[PDB]
Amino acid sequence: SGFRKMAFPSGKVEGCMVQVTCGTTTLNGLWLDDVVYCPRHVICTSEDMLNPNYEDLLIRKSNHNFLVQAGNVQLRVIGHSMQNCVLKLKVDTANPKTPKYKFVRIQPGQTFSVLACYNGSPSGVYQCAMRPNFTIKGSFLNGSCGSVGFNIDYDCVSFCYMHHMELPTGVHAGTDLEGNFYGPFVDRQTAQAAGTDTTITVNVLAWLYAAVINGDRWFLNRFTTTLNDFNLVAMKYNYEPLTQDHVDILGPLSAQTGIAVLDMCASLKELLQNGMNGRTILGSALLEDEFTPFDVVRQCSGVTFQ
Amino acid sequence: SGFRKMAFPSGKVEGCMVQVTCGTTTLNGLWLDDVVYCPRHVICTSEDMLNPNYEDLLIRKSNHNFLVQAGNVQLRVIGHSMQNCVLKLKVDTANPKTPKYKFVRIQPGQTFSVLACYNGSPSGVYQCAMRPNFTIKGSFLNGSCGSVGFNIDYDCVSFCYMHHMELPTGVHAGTDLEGNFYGPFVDRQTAQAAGTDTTITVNVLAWLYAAVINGDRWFLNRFTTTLNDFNLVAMKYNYEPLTQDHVDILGPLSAQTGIAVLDMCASLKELLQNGMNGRTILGSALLEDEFTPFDVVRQCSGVTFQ
Ligand SMILES: *[C@@H](O)[C@H](C[C@@H]1CCCNC1=O)NC(=O)[C@H](CC1CCCCC1)NC(=O)[C@@H](NC(=O)OCc1ccccc1)[C@@H](C)OC(C)(C)C
Ligand SMILES: *[C@@H](O)[C@H](C[C@@H]1CCCNC1=O)NC(=O)[C@H](CC1CCCCC1)NC(=O)[C@@H](NC(=O)OCc1ccccc1)[C@@H](C)OC(C)(C)C
């Protein structure tokens, strides 16, 4: 019993974070085998963030310009190269704590965990999702860029996010580990905004199913509706359309609970259309959307890793 | 910018969790130097949870009844003993990954992090507080007992909680690491309940200060009130009294923000007395109480560990 925002154990990823310094800049990097990864605006100084040519600034630097410290031990760079918006520094030592790992690029609505870092030292770990506007509501301060996002699956570490920048509204933008940005953002200090966001409808239903598994139940009715008659009302409250494929993924949830998938839709239909009258689902007073169907089953049914 | 429920990196504690089996029972244990810790109702079978005499059941067992596995490696017990409600099994190997560590017993209103475990394998990590009724709203399933709660402070690991049982309402009860229960609960399967809870008033003000640091500001007024005139209204909404000592601990928050401590009290006074009219503080629609003044400053100002 109970339902919490839960994050994967962060031990395997702490064994990788290091510090990278060049000029007057210092940020976090990720050390795997004999390569350290970090954002490229670490070759930028404060004059190089208007509209820089990174290719031409990287021909200026030499290998000994990059200070890499892992613990109170200095790593020696021997080569360097550029892949999109990330930078790769080849060092002469291999990380003995390198886990089974794997770069993947995620799709909006999926969730991951974030280990925030400063000066190569982990500070804390929390759970996020990629919003439909391709940003993330993180907790980040100065020096945080270089932190990664990641999921664990049995024992493999799927790295999916490197952090780069905060936006005027306070949400956040970064890349996948192959250096490509999530969203239409670029790494030059000009004007940018996020674009209009929507609520992740499939996740909302998954949390509502979690509720019934835990005891809560004042929200189910006897009505049903059709898949098109749902989207008509979802349209208006700025939710995303729900698709036939989303329906299937909710099969084992509907199964174990007894509540048909289209039945729970007609329940959510009223909640949007009447508010909550001051009562709470799973401790919350809002309709919460940062829980996938995966997250519900791994937490309500007992799945660990190794 | 941004404000999230954050948990300490769990790496140092994953190096300790093991599995303990005896009879038909299996649960988690904590391995430090040459000692493994676990709850004593692991010598209990299913017949031994009505009203057992543990002292007299422990004279029955022999050292080879306790299977201890750390990884796919078997630990050999050589001795065993009882300290209140926890059980200590001395094994012939010392844990090489034993961190700087330290047992402490916490006070209601303080927060800690929990690494949930099953079969000696970590599953996930989240943030809790000790409620004023001495229980905790965790996320726990079968096999979870043996998980610990802990804070990190620079590089020392202060272990403060071992998990034992769920209560009819679904909150949770356990002990400190020296085996003493938080609360008036006992480890025998009879009737027990939690008692009436209150809201943690000092934490509510600390989260409200976090809000102002982040931009939110529609809740401050020009009124003030007195410390006694606050408790009069706190009394009625089932909040805890606020004391002169609590006031001091809010000094650096009030400082950096400019809002006097008694000024924020008069602001909270209205919020209780008018509701929120459908607007949200730090993404939330409720008044949130699981953030201490410590938690706010370490997150809003950049503190890590090593
Ligand atoms: C990594 O250490 C660091 C983290 C930032 C620091 C402030 C709080 N949160 C963070 O995540 N990232 C940076 O230092 C960014 C610098 C790069 C410059 C070249 C490539 C892009 C990022 N700085 C930022 O994150 C800034 N954001 C930004 O550039 O916004 C785009 C913009 C600019 C002007 C007008 C409109 C939009 C932040 C710190 O500055 C703002 C304006 C967001 C306060
Ligand atoms: C540790 O593996 C395990 C975890 C439990 C399992 C269910 C979900 N959540 C959990 O945390 N703990 C136990 O197995 C407990 C057994 C011990 C028995 C002797 C010493 C006390 C605990 N079991 C429980 O946690 C049970 N709780 C309980 O005993 O409640 C007290 C009570 C009993 C009868 C009437 C009133 C009060 C749970 C599983 O059973 C309930 C009744 C809560 C469903």
Using CA atoms, how far apart are residues A166 and A136, in angstroms rounded to an integer? 10
Residues of chain A with CATH 2.40.10.10: 1-14+100-197, 15-99
SS3 string of chain B? CCCCCCECCCHHHHCCEEEEEECCEEEEEEEECCEEEEEHHHCCCCCCCCCCCHHHHHCCCCHHHCEEECCCCEECEEEEEEECCEEEEEECCCCCCCCCEEECCCCCCCEEEEEEEECCEEEEEEEEECCCCCCECCCCCCCCECEEEEEEECCEEEEEEEEEEECCCCCEEEECCCCCECCCCCCCCCCCCCCCCCECHHHHHHHHHHHHHHCCCCCCCCCCCCHHHHHHHHHHCCECCCCHHHHHHCHHHHHHHCCCHHHHHHHHHHHHHHCCCCCCECCECCCCCCCCHHHHHHHHHCCCCC
In a 13 Å sphere around the CA of B113, the CA atoms on its Cβ side amount to: 30
Is B142 a pocket residue for ligand 2 (Cβ < 6 Å)?
Answer: yes
Whether A214 sits inside 8 A of B170 (CB atoms) is: yes
Q: State both tokens at A25.
A: 């800049």
Give the phi and the psi of residue A97 in degrees, each rounded to 5.
-90, 15
Catalytic residue among A16, A44, A145, A160: A145
The catalytically annotated residue of B145, B163, B164, B265 is B145
Calpha distance B90→B37 (Å, rounded): 9
Active site residue A145: yes
Q: How far apart are CA B222 and CA B72, in angstroms?
A: 64
Indicate the DSSP class of residue A63: G
CA distance B98 to chain A (A): 14
3-state secondary structure of A29: strand
Assess whether the C-beta atom of A201 lies below 6 angstroms from ligand 1.
no
Q: How far is B62 from chain A (nearest CA, A)?
A: 31
Q: Reduce the DSSP state of residue A173 to 3 states and report it.
A: strand
Residues of A in contact with B306 (CB under 8 A): 121
Give the tokens for residue B131.
């409620």
A201: phi then psi, degrees, rounded to nearest 5 = -65, -40
Give the contacts of B31 (CB within 8 A, at least 6 positions apart). B16, B17, B18, B37, B70, B75, B91, B95, B98
CA angle B138, A114, A65 (to 5 degrees): 150
* DSSP β-bridge partners for residue B88: B37, B81
Secondary structure class of A216 (helix, strand, coil) = coil
A156-166 and A101-103 strand pairing: parallel
Amino acid at B160: C
Residue B49 in contact with ligand 2 by CB distance below 6 A: yes
Torsion from C-alpha of B277, B246, B153, A28, nearest 10 degrees:
40
A55 Cα to chain B: minimum distance (Å) = 31
Helix (H/G/I), strand (E/B), else coil: A24 = coil
Report how far residue A26's alpha carbon sits from residue A35's, in angstroms, rounded to the nearest whole number. Answer: 18
Closest CA to A72 of A120, A35, A36, A37: A120
Residues A128, A129, A133, A135, Cα dihedral to 10°: 30
What interhelical angle do A261-274 and A227-236 show, nearest 10? 30
Query: How many angstroms separate the CA atoms of B248 and B227, rounded?
Result: 13
Identify the helix (H) or strand (E) that includes residue A254.
helix A251-257
Which member of A14, A172, A215 has the closest CB to residue B11?
A14
The region, left, alpha or beta by phi > 0 then psi within -120 to 50, assigned to residue B50 is: alpha
Residue B168 C-alpha to ligand 2 middle, in angstroms? 8
For chain B, what is the largest distance between any 2 Cα atoms, rounded to a whole number of angstroms? 70
Q: Is B164 left (phi over 0), alpha (psi -120 to 50) or beta?
A: alpha
CA–CA distance, B77 with B63 (Å, rounded to integer): 6
Question: Best residue in A17, A27, A123 to probe B by mutation, most B CBs within 10 Å?
Answer: A123
Determine whether the interchain pair B214/A170 forms a contact, defined as Cβ–Cβ distance below 8 Å: yes
How far from each other are the two terminal CA atoms of chain A, in whole angstroms?
23
Task: Please count the other Cβ atoms lying within 10 Å of the Cβ belonging to residue B292.
Answer: 19
Q: Does domain B15-99 have CATH number 2.40.10.10?
A: yes
Of the candidates A32, A48, A75, the residue with the CA atom closest to the CA atom of residue A40? A48
Kindly list the residues from chain A whose CB atom is less than 8 angstroms away from the CB atom of residue B140.
1-2
Location of structure tokens 């670490």: A42
Q: Tokens standing for B158?
A: 């202060």
- Residue holding tokens 């300290």? B83
Are B285 and A283 an interchain contact pair (Cβ–Cβ within 8 Å)?
no
> Which chain A residue shows the shortest CA-CA distance from B304?
A123
How many other C-beta atoms can be found within 10 angstroms of the C-beta atom of residue A50? Answer: 9
Residue B168 near residue B100 (C-beta atoms within 8 A): no
Architecture of domain B1-14+100-197: Beta Barrel (2.40)
Q: Two tokens at B57? A: 């059941």
Instruction: Report the sign of the C-alpha dihedral through residues B229, B232, B234, B240, in that order.
Output: positive
Q: Please report, as a single letter, which amino acid is at residue B147.
A: S
Q: Which B residues in the span 136-195 are in contact with A, Cβ-Cβ below 8 Å?
A: 137-143, 166, 170-172
Catalytic residue, chosen from B22, B38, B41, B128, is B41
Q: Could B118 and A302 be called an inter-chain contact, meaning their C-beta atoms sit closer than 8 Å?
A: yes
Q: Tokens for B247?
A: 């006031």
Dig out the tokens for B143 from the structure: 């096999």
Across the interface, whether the CB atoms of B170 and A14 are under 8 A apart is answered no
For the Cβ of B48 lying below 6 angstroms from any atom of ligand 2, the answer is no
Q: Which residues have C-beta within 8 Å of that of residue B129, sequence separation ≥ 6?
A: B109, B110, B111, B112, B136, B200, B203, B289, B290, B292
Work out whether strand A111-118 and strand A101-103 pair parallel, antiparallel, or are unpaired: unpaired
What are the backbone angles phi and psi of residue A181, rounded to the nearest 5°?
-70, 140
How many CB pairs (< 8 A) connect A and B?
Answer: 138
Neighbour tally for B12: CB within 10 Å: 21
Tokens for A44, please give them. 């930028």
In chain A, how long is the greatest CA-to-CA distance? Answer: 70
Contact B52, B188 (CB under 8 A): yes
- Indicate which residue's Cα is closest to atom 37 of ligand 2: B191
What's domain A198-301's architecture?
A: Orthogonal Bundle (1.10)
Say if CB A288 and CB A243 are below 8 A apart: no
Tokens 């047992």 -> residue: B103
**B137 and A14 in contact by Cβ < 8 A?**
no
Q: With beta carbons under 8 A apart, name residues in chain B contacting A3.
A: 139
Measured in angstroms, the CA of A124 and the nearest CA of chain B are apart by 5
Residues of A in Cβ contact (< 8 Å) with B139: 2-4, 6, 299
Q: Tell me whether residue B156 is exposed, middle or buried, using C-beta atoms within 10 angstroms of its C-beta: 0 to 12, 13 to 18, 19 or more.
A: middle
Which two structure tokens, joined as six digits, stand for A214? Answer: 């835990």
| Dist CA A7 CA A295 (whole Å) | 10
Q: Is the dihedral of CA B114, B119, B120, B123 positive or negative?
A: negative
Decide if B64 is catalytic.
no
Q: How far is the CA of B215 from the centre of ligand 1 (A)?
A: 17
Q: What tokens does A107 get?
A: 């799709």
